[PDB]
Ligand binder design. Structure first.
Ligand SMILES: [Mg+2]
Ligand SMILES: [Mg+2]
Ligand SMILES: [Mg+2]
Ligand SMILES: [Mg+2]
Ligand SMILES: [Mg+2]
Ligand SMILES: [Mg+2]
Ligand SMILES: [Mg+2]
Ligand SMILES: [Mg+2]
Ligand SMILES: [Mg+2]
Ligand SMILES: [Mg+2]
Ligand SMILES: [Mg+2]
Ligand SMILES: [Mg+2]
Ligand SMILES: [Mg+2]
Ligand SMILES: [Mg+2]
Ligand SMILES: [Mg+2]
Ligand SMILES: [Mg+2]
Ligand SMILES: [Mg+2]
Ligand SMILES: [Mg+2]
Ligand SMILES: [Mg+2]
Ligand SMILES: [Mg+2]
Ligand SMILES: [Mg+2]
Ligand SMILES: [Mg+2]
Ligand SMILES: [Mg+2]
Ligand SMILES: [Mg+2]
Ligand SMILES: [Mg+2]
Ligand SMILES: [Mg+2]
Ligand SMILES: [Mg+2]
Lengths: 69, 98, 125, 173, 242
RNA sequence: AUUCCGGUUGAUCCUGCCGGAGGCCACUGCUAUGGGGGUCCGACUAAGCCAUGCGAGUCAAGGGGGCGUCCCUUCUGGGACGCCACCGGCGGACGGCUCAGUAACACGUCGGUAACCUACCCUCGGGAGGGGGAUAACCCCGGGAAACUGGGGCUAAUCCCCCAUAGGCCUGGGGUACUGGAAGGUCCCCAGGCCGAAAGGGAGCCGUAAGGCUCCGCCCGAGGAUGGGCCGGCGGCCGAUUAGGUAGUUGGUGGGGUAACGGCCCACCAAGCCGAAGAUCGGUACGGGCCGUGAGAGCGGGAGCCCGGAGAUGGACACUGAGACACGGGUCCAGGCCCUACGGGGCGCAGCAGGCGCGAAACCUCCGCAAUGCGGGAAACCGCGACGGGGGGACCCCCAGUGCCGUGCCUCUGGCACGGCUUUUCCGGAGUGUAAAAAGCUCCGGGAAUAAGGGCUGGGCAAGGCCGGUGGCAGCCGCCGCGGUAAUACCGGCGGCCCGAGUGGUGGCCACUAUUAUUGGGCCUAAAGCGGCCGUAGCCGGGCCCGUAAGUCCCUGGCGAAAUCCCACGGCUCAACCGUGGG
RNA sequence: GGUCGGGUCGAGCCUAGGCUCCGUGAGGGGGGAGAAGUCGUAACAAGGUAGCCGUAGGGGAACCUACGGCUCGAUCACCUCCU
RNA sequence: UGGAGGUGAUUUAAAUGCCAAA
């Protein structure tokens, strides 16, 4: 259901539909649905090592938005 | 069934009636499909917001389908965030989580 | 290994899908190919219900009976022929119905060595 | 298949809003002071069962049929619904009022124990009435004819005293 | 019984010839192998506790049995699973009472009081007969027990005859042949517990069982299987029957 | 109750479908005082994954030891008495759980085995003679992170192994004693072989001793019983937009193997076997007793209780045993997961509780072996999440309450004011009840005190032509239809109707429906007679006479478990429920 | 119990080919609702050329034309066959 | 009196439905 909620938020906001898991586990059905619907998930164990990954992915998406523009 | 609200819409009545009927788009949790559900009651659409979860059921028309002057809509909303919608419309209860 | 339960074919030719595992009480065992040898050798098998079978694996003597009802214990030379299998005679395999040659003439086996543990034969004329 | 499930002992009307049926049932409910419709419906079902057994046995022949025929007549006239010389045909002329007259509440009212139907109901429920030496607290119990005359105030009740104020008012009518 | 023998018995599946309340509890006593078969016998515990009523629970019933208070065919039985069957004798010497076990008119087992003089004999139907080593004859009875006779006497005994045996010594004292005019008692079937005299015998091809005709006291004739007809006398019964 | 009502027109009669009105099952809104009975509660999606505790033991009257307490003499010891583990015996193959697979001799029913196995138990007939051997426990030393595991010393048995005799099995030649419908069977006599028993053990009294006298036991044979294996005839789903299928395939002869018959498996010889009366292939499904509904004929379902089958993460395979290819026993592969000192080692709750996940959808990490049974024991007894007892729950059914009486007044059904009464129910006590409790039941004290909701209100369809808001907006509407500034139809007030501890919403099946038609429908113009004809299987077939007895009808034997259904009588206060009889 | 030799049964694994299911998918095709866009007026009266069936050709679009058929075709005059 | 058929003919051009009803 978390992936469903994330997709609902992503429907109208591309940059705010994402999941940040801190020392948790991802179920088989959840990862299958995320792969099918192309939703990004960042799993980690360190707070800064997890936040910086999301920041840099957002920056890469931002630059790719205008790279082909 | 249980689903998540994607957006609010309005549907015109069939001729010769006049008016707009308040509905929502719902994505089902069990299989990911998208359906349309009617919101019964006077002013009921105010208690629905985007990203809420709802419980829906059939609307009760002939042969288990649509009814009245709204063809194309087969379901109606029953609960919102685990609170009965009929209560909210009458009063007697207030929607949680603000 | 050796399952004697049922065939997987219907008499019309269609196939049968097995609906259970193989039960233990339906298994068979390796055939004993009783050969001619210099010295006899037999073993004992514990069977269903806790019974026993004597299995003869190498035969050197035989019991021969005449039409008068007397018997003699003599030794076996070779297997002349065996109608059960085309190549039993060359390998000297003894089964019921085989023709063996002895020191007092040819004889036809009347017992089942793999089930009884002895070779009995009636004399031929 | 499926194991046994216990079923209801009464039947509901085929149409809930029929004017004539509502009028008739209201008359009965008010006269005999029943609590709800299902109580009434219970008694109706009893009557129908009796009728359904009589219709089946008129058309039967054999040895078991005669046994069941005499058993039906004996049970009917043990309850006080038929005279001791009645025949099978007389089963088909029974009405609902005949059964409602056999309730313990109605009989307590008719014998003079209470002034009203409602007072009789309360007298029964609170445990002031004894039947054949035993206290019964069900107002709908059907009274056998053989035990009708042993119906009195319980020997421990306040009312089993000719000087009690409420008993005297009952005697006054 | 996926892998082996059954050891339990539910009340609802119990034999239909017992007097027992089938919904009061879950389990019933599964009888031990023994003399008669399941359809014509009952365990001893029910006789002690339910029928005669000398015990309230099973535990105190087992205390009575372990002290040696009951005799079946004159022998002490201590096993509470032991089966008691048709034509057996139950004796309580401490109270001095004797019973014979018999089927009812509806097919259930009951205890019939008898005298002490008659309690020493037991009738046994000859179920089979064979040759045994040393050229002797072995007689196999309706309750499963066996007896030996010499080759000289071989013509006095045939199947369906009845032997009156003295218990517990097991010594023969009478032979009752099966023939026209014999007095019989029926032990199974629709005509169970009726009695009378033999009138006719009929036979059929290919292993179908043979049938007999019986006349009762009032003059009515009825048929039954030959093996359901137990001989009890020449022209009058030798034992007490209800 | 063997039933109708609304809807096609400006109006009418039809055909035809949709809707209303009834019952039952699952989920769910709002709302709830009490008791009793019962076969109710993670079945539908995930036969998905699981921490912790428990779900199978028992025997001191089979045997040697260790420790403790007392008595006699005790340098020692010998005794009794009680504990503890080990060797040894029996059991753990039943019971409990779930419904994935399976369209099949899986299941129901009638038969068969002269083609077979069976520890425990019952009866009758016999036997118990002579030798040998190790080893746990215990003492010395240990190894490894642990799981586990090494060497040396000594000892016993109802433990193990030999020898004899009884006994069993195979083949050839004779005899005719038994059962049976019928002997490849049983019995007797010769002859050639192969296999091959036993624990006179344990307890107690009389015994001065000699030795009896009971109690429990060991081995062989014949039969039964109990529990099964195997086989046959008949009976019960959907598809032709699946038409040909099979090659150990169908049969024969000779063998092997099995507890046993059999292409069950081999060697050789033939060309059979199944099919439009539906083979083969695909879909869906555990079968039945039964259950829901209906006037019946029928139509639909098969979780819960009983009987049968199958499975233990998926797939294969073995040891022990009377019985297993074994849910709380073993091995391999695949796939998950856990602990390591990194060298290795472990685990699958579709048992009772409990947790996560999935979903619209489902309970306490409780007490007891007192009852009913099972395993062990000579017995007394011991163990059992089976079963019994409670805890949570608008599961099903039965019986009740939320006051009653009199006199006045009122808008006279009802409401109010006076005076009285009762205590089911509620609060506090004593007894009985129970394994112990809790409920329940009998008494005592207080007091009308502690207790009504849900839907509907234009027609169908019972109930308002009242008032205030809104103004083709908002809303209602199963169907027909309302709402456009004077709404009996929307929102609210006040009235009224139905049912009532319940009452409404959604989805499914039966009825409605003679819209599946045997009973019992239609085809000129409304859906529907092949464009026409000839003919193979199938169905339907003229009159009389004689025979038969397959269908058909009547009478009678053996069967179709129990529970469930109907009736009377009896026990719980009556009932629901339970027992004895008849169907 | 180890090691080797032989015979036989076998889950799994790899390669090739042939069938079939699920997800995406450029491009294309008709169907159904909506009715304040557009061009015409084909069907109903003889609907202004009677309508319709089969076949074939043609045309922005409803449609038009040829051969054989049906009445489920209006009006007038004459003829035939009946009651 | 009321019906059923057959053969002939039938004199230019002439498309559409808006405000409403509410
Ligand atoms: Mg079932
Ligand atoms: Mg019309
Ligand atoms: Mg279940
Ligand atoms: Mg599950
Ligand atoms: Mg098992
Ligand atoms: Mg299935
Ligand atoms: Mg020996
Ligand atoms: Mg089925
Ligand atoms: Mg649980
Ligand atoms: Mg539920
Ligand atoms: Mg209103
Ligand atoms: Mg009305
Ligand atoms: Mg209908
Ligand atoms: Mg019709
Ligand atoms: Mg035609
Ligand atoms: Mg035609
Ligand atoms: Mg023809
Ligand atoms: Mg004829
Ligand atoms: Mg006939
Ligand atoms: Mg039955
Ligand atoms: Mg009573
Ligand atoms: Mg009664
Ligand atoms: Mg009963
Ligand atoms: Mg035109
Ligand atoms: Mg035209
Ligand atoms: Mg042209
Ligand atoms: Mg016009």
């Amino acid at each position: 259901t978390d992936v469903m909620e994330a997709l609902s938020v992503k429907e109208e906001e591309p940059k705010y539909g994402v999941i940040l898991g801190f020392n948790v586990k991802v179920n088989e059905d959840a990862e299958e649905v995320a792969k099918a619907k192309d939703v990004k998930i960042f799993v980690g164990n360190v707070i800064y090592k997890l936040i910086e990954d999301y920041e840099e992915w957002v920056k890469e998406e931002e630059e790719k938005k205008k790279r082909e523009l | 069934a249980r689903g998540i609200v994607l957006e609010k819409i309005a549907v015109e009545a069939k001729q010769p009636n006049s008016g707009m009927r308040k509905a929502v788009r719902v994505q089902l949790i069990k299989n990911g499909k998208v359906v349309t559900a009617f919101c019964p009651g006077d002013g009921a659409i105010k208690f629905i917001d985007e990203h809420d979860e709802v419980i829906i059921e059939g609307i009760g028309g002939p042969k288990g389908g649509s009814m009245g002057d709204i063809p194309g809509i087969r379901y109606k909303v029953v609960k919102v965030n685990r609170v009965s919608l009929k209560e909210l419309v009458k009063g007697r209860k207030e929607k949680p989580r603000r | 290994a050796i399952w004697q339960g049922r065939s997987l074919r219907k008499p019309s030719g269609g196939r049968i899908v097995l609906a259970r595992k193989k039960r233990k009480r339906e298994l068979g065992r390796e055939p004993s190919n009783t050969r001619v040898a210099e010295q006899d050798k037999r073993k004992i098998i514990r069977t269903y219900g806790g019974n026993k079978k004597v299995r003869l694996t190498a035969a050197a003597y035989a019991n021969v009976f005449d039409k008068s009802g007397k018997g003699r214990k003599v030794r076996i030379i070779r297997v002349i022929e065996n109608p059960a299998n085309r190549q039993f005679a060359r390998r000297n395999i003894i089964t019921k119905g085989a023709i063996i040659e002895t020191e007092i003439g040819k004889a036809k086996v009347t017992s089942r060595p793999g089930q009884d543990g002895v070779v009995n034969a009636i004399l031929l004329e | 298949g499926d194991p046994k499930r216990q079923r209801k002992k009464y039947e509901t009307p085929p149409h809930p809003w029929i004017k004539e049926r509502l009028d008739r049932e209201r008359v009965l409910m008010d006269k005999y002071e029943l609590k709800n419709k299902k109580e009434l419906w219970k008694h109706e079902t009893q009557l129908k069962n009796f009728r359904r057994r009589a219709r089946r046995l008129l058309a039967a022949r054999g040895k078991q049929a005669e046994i069941e025929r005499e058993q039906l007549l004996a049970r009917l006239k043990r309850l006080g619904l038929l005279p001791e010389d009645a025949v099978l045909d007389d089963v088909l002329s029974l009405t609902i009022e005949d059964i409602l007259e056999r309730r313990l509440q109605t009989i307590v009212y008719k014998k003079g124990l209470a002034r009203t139907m409602r007072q009789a109901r309360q007298l029964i429920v609170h445990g002031h009435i004894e039947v054949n030496g035993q206290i019964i607290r069900s107002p709908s119990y059907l009274v056998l004819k053989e035990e009708e005359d042993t119906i009195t105030y319980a020997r421990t009740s306040p009312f089993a005293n000719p000087q009690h104020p409420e008993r005297m008012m009952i005697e006054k009518a | 019984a996926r892998k082996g023998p059954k050891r339990h018995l539910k009340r609802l599946a119990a034999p239909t010839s017992w007097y027992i309340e089938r919904k009061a509890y879950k389990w019933a006593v599964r009888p031990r192998p023994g003399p008669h078969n399941m359809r014509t016998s009952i365990p001893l515990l029910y006789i002690v506790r339910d029928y005669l009523g000398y015990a309230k629970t099973a535990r105190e019933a087992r205390k009575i049995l372990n002290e040696g208070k009951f005799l079946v065919d004159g022998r002490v039985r201590k096993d509470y699973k032991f089966p008691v069957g048709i034509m057996d004798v139950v004796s309580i010497p401490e109270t001095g009472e004797h019973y014979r076990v018999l089927p009812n008119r509806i097919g259930k087992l009951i205890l019939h009081p008898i005298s002490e003089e008659e309690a020493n004999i037991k009738p046994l139907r000859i179920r089979n007969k064979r040759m045994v080593k040393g050229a002797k004859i072995q007689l196999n009875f309706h309750d499963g027990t066996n007896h030996l006779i010499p080759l000289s006497e071989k013509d006095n005994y045939f199947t369906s005859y009845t032997v009156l045996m003295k218990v517990p010594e097991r010594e023969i004292l009478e032979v009752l042949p099966f023939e026209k005019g014999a007095y019989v008692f029926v032990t199974q079937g629709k005509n169970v517990a009726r009695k009378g005299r033999i009138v006719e015998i009929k036979k059929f091809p290919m292993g179908w069982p043979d049938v007999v005709t019986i006349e009762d006291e009032e003059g009515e004739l009825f048929d039954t299987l030959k093996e359901y007809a137990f001989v009890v006398g020449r022209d009058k019964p030798r034992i007490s029957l209800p």
